[PDB]
Amino acid sequence: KNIIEKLQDIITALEERLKPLVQAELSVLVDVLHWPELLFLEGSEAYQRCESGGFLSKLIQHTKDLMESEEKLCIKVLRTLQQMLLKKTKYGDRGNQLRKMLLQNYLQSAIAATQCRLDKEGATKLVCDLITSTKNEKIFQESIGL
Amino acid sequence: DYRKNQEHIAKQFGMMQSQIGYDILAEDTITALLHNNRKLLEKHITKTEVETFVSLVRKNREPRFLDYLSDLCVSNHIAIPVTQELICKCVLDPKNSDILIRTELRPEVWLTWTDKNNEHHEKSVRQLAQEARAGNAHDENVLSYYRYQLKLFARMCLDRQYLAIDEISQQLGVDLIFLCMADEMLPFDLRASFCHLMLHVHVDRDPQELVTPVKFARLWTEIPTAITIKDYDSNLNNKFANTMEFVEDYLNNVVSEAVPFANEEKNKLTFEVVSLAHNLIYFGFYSFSELLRLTRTLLGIIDCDIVVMETKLKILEILQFILNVRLDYRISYLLSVFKKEFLDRIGEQAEAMFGSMLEVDDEGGRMFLRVLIHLTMHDYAPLVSGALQLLFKHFSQRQEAMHTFKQVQLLISAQDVENYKVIKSELDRLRTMVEKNYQIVKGILERLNKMCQMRKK
């Protein structure tokens, strides 16, 4: 019947509405990754292990030695890492409150700072290793983007 | 770990095969060589080799030969249908049915063995376990032989080797396996072996089947007026109830401890129970309502050794299946809202759905993120990959839900839609026949081909 038209219209409207908050959720995840130690219990061995950006180094190593394992995972990790070092901006007043609530629940010159932190983690070697090993279009292109 | 070197060594294999059974470390070496090269196993494994191995096991009566024979059934821990069939044929004949220790239930469990001297010794299962715990040559040998025989029997039935399962199940019933496993007095190794045997001989049998959480196609009439949390399970609506109860109790008891993965004896039992739970969940026996609590317990048994890594990977897979079920429930809720509409209120309902009972956690989701972060720092590559995937998925559920809703293809159409039910009915018999006359299969294939712009639909 014609109910397919109404269903598709409702789906399109819902997707358009949810678009403002998808980026907010992605930013919330990026922020959570930015300061991983903020989540784990303070004073625990994980706090010290993750104190010096341990999660960052582990993710960098996995991405470097993970291109063959799963291209999608490597691409997503690279995109998230680039978004983290790519500043931030208001995701819309409608989704601003949602992002704030999500950050609160999941967690009880700045560009230069994060760039230097990523460099210390060893993102330079990551990008150069991705570049000078792979012909896959997305892999090399996203390494250039990073 | 050398394909080229393995092939070069295998080039001259007849000499090694002939010099087997002379007390030299060659039979084990030969088995190790033919452990990964499925092609090598096919080329060098035949009836003669299996018969020679069986004769050597009978003569020596030592567990090592049985373990070596069992290890040949599984190649790369995936399958070996030709080798598995040959091993089952060689080790299932009544004539060879003398090197396997029989088990029976008496008013308890009793194991009967033929002894190396062609004797007939029957010992109580509980009494045998007590003697083995005390420590004795005969008791230790009996326990080791029983463990190796159970492992070999379970391996022989790997995947769907019905030709051997049909006999193994009758030899050791599901009820007997459940009674033996739920003892807590026998050594942990024997309990783990029994659990593995039960999982691989009475869980993955013909009745059970795999389940796909995210059913991309849904029936228009199926969608109800309103889908409650229980609705997603009530609408869906077996016999191993005691097995499920034992699994749940063991998992809960493991969770209610400090350093849950500490004792190797209990570590093996946990690694077997987790595998059984994963198989049951993937089989669809459990429901969403109980699935939430099971996932909460599993996560609690991971927060804050190859066996430990494997158990963590299995728990991660179970959690991923639970997340897929949750995404399916969200899609069902959206479809139910759309059907109720028959605007903006639907927008509010959608925004409130993906924001709550439908949450796999106990601290507002913080537990899942903490567990994923801790696992990410781990060593095992599969564990790291799974943790990274789960972390990147959890915080991006809205996009995945929207994409799923964009792939749902309702079948509200007329009898043409009923063609979908007809196709499902045909595929049921097709899969049943594939698991295990040819006229029915040919007719089903012809009908499917005939059924297959309408081509896109």
What are the structure tokens assigned to B153, written together? 């029997």
- Burial tier of B303 (Cβ tally within 10 Å: 0-12, 13-18, 19+): middle
B350 touches chain A (CB under 8 A): yes
CA distance B358 to B229: 7
Q: Which amino acid is at B5?
A: N
Task: Report whether B403 contacts A19 (CB < 8 A).
Answer: no
> Which chain B residues contact residue A105 at CB under 8 A?
364-366
CA distance B81 to B419: 36
B346 touches chain A (CB under 8 A): yes
**Residue B110 forms beta bridges with which residues?**
B104, B124
Give binding residues of B for Ca(2+) as ranges: 160, 435
Provide the 3-class DSSP secondary structure of residue B165.
Answer: helix
Q: Which amino acid is at B234?
A: S
B410 touches chain A (CB under 8 A): yes
DSSP B122: E
DSSP B101: P
Task: Report whether B408 contacts B331 (CB < 8 A).
Answer: yes
- Whether B396 sits inside 8 A of A1 (CB atoms) is no
A66 touches chain B (CB under 8 A): yes
* Cα dist from B264 to B70, B128, B189, B276, whole Å: 23, 22, 10, 18
Q: Which long-range contacts (CB under 8 A, 24 or more apart) does B243-250 make?
A: B243/B174, B243/B178, B243/B198, B243/B203, B243/B276, B243/B280, B244/B280, B244/B285, B244/B286, B246/B178, B246/B181, B246/B182, B247/B273, B247/B276, B247/B277, B247/B280, B248/B294, B248/B297
Task: Report whether B35 contacts B42 (CB < 8 A).
Answer: no
- Burial tier of A135 (Cβ tally within 10 Å: 0-12, 13-18, 19+): exposed
Strands (E), B83-220: 102-105, 109-113, 121-124
B403 touches chain A (CB under 8 A): no
**Residue B104 forms beta bridges with which residues?**
B110
Q: Which of B259, B334, B373 would you mutate first to test chain A, the one with the most A CBs within 10 A?
A: B373
CA distance A99 to B352: 14
Task: Report whether B41 contacts B34 (CB < 8 A).
Answer: yes
* Cα dist from B95 to A32, B62, B90, B100, B145, whole Å: 66, 19, 10, 11, 19
CA distance A61 to B279: 32
Residues 6+ apart with CB under 8 A from B161: B81, B84, B85, B88
Residues 6+ apart with CB under 8 A from B242: B178, B182
Provide the 3-class DSSP secondary structure of residue B110.
Answer: strand
Q: Which long-range contacts (CB under 8 A, 24 or more apart) does A39-45 make?
A: A39/A106, A39/A107, A39/B366, A39/B369, A39/B370, A39/B373, A40/B370, A40/B373, A40/B374, A44/B304
Widest pairwise Cα distance in chain B: 84
* Cα dist from A63 to A98, A117, B90, B377, whole Å: 30, 17, 48, 13
Task: Report whether B246 contacts B181 (CB < 8 A).
Answer: yes
CA distance B86 to B203: 23
Q: Which residue of A has its CA nearest to B345?
A: A14
- Whether B369 sits inside 8 A of A32 (CB atoms) is yes
Is the alpha carbon torsion for B181, B187, B188, B192 positive or negative? negative
Residues 6+ apart with CB under 8 A from A21: A91, A94, A95, A98, A99, B351, B398
Task: Report whether B332 contacts B358 (CB < 8 A).
Answer: no
CA triple A87-A88-A91, angle to 5 deg: 160
- Whether A14 sits inside 8 A of B406 (CB atoms) is no
Q: Which amino acid is at A32?
A: V
CA distance B191 to B193: 5
How many Cα atoms are found within 13 Å in the side-chain-facing hemisphere of B40? 25
B373 touches chain A (CB under 8 A): yes
> Which chain A residues contact residue B410 at CB under 8 A?
3-4, 7
> Which chain B residues contact residue A28 at CB under 8 A?
395
Task: Report whether B151 contacts B193 (CB < 8 A).
Answer: yes
Task: Measure CB to CB from residue A22 to each of B369, B388, B399 and give the nearest one.
Answer: B399
Residues 6+ apart with CB under 8 A from B85: B161, B163
- Whether A39 sits inside 8 A of B373 (CB atoms) is yes
| Backbone angle region of B113, left / alpha / beta, with phi > 0 → left and psi within -120 to 50 → alpha | beta
Residues 6+ apart with CB under 8 A from B387: B316, B372, B373, B375, B376, B378
DSSP code string of A61-120:
HHHHTTTTT-HHHHHHHHHHHHHHTS------HHHHHHHHHHHHHH---HHHHHHHHHHH
What are the structure tokens assigned to B440, written together? 């029915």
Provide the 3-class DSSP secondary structure of residue B96.
Answer: coil
Method for this entry:
cryo-EM
What are the structure tokens assigned to B188, written together? 């942990």
A49 touches chain B (CB under 8 A): yes
Q: Which of B275, B70, B105, B108 is nearest to B186 (CA)?
A: B108
What are the structure tokens assigned to B329, written together? 């429930």
**Which alpha helices (H) appear in B199-263, and where do they start and end?**
231-234, 241-255
**Residue B103 forms beta bridges with which residues?**
B111
A51 touches chain B (CB under 8 A): no
Q: Which of B358, B49, B84, B397 is nearest to B229 (CA)?
A: B358
CA distance B219 to B85: 42
Q: Which of B333, B370, B392 would you mutate first to test chain A, the one with the most A CBs within 10 A?
A: B392
* Cα dist from B221 to B57, B117, B142, B404, whole Å: 61, 69, 60, 20
- How many Cβ contacts (< 8 angstroms) between chains A and B? 101
Strands (E), B251-295: none
**Which alpha helices (H) appear in B199-240, and where do they start and end?**
231-234
Map tokens 């560009």 to a residue: A111
Provide the 3-class DSSP secondary structure of residue B271.
Answer: helix
